A and B are shown apart, each in its own frame.
Chain A
Amino acid sequence: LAGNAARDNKKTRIIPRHLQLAVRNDEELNKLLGRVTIAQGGVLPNIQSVLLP
């Protein structure tokens, strides 16, 4: 999943952001790693629909 995330951004080296995206963009891995914080990982881009004009 990390490699798939990396290829999706035209990169050849897996970075912690890619691990974050791969883990959080999966149904079961997120459940498995719900209480784990990844350094230099960031969050998922999302905006609530009641804030966009």
Chain B
Amino acid sequence: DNIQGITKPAIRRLARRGGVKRISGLIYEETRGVLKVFLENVIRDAVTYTEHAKRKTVTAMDVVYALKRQGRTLYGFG
């Protein structure tokens, strides 16, 4: 269970950056589930790109293309 590695204070930190003052006790699991779903989708696309490229290593450009496919362009890792 590495999902528990996303610590409670880490989620509090992300919320603080977002501008949340007071956090309820169930926000953390819900965020864990959301992040799991999002990462699952992105990783699925990235591995699809890799397997099409016949590679075994997963390049960063594949992550970039996947994020673009989702519709979230990322500047910096080009």
Contact = CB atoms under 8 A, between A and B. Distances in A.
Q: Do chains A and B touch in the complex (CB under 8 A)?
A: yes
Interface of A: 16, 35-40, 43, 46-48, 51
Contact of A47 (B19, B67, B74): B19
Interface size class of B (residues with CB under 8 A): 10 to 19
Contacts, number: 25
A35 B73 contact: yes
Contacts of A36: 73-75
Contacts of B17: 43
7 contacts: A16-B76, A36-B73, A37-B72, A39-B74, A39-B75, A39-B77, A51-B21
Ranked nearest first, the 4 interchain pairs of A and B with the lowest CB-CB distance are A39-B76, A36-B73, A51-B21, A37-B74
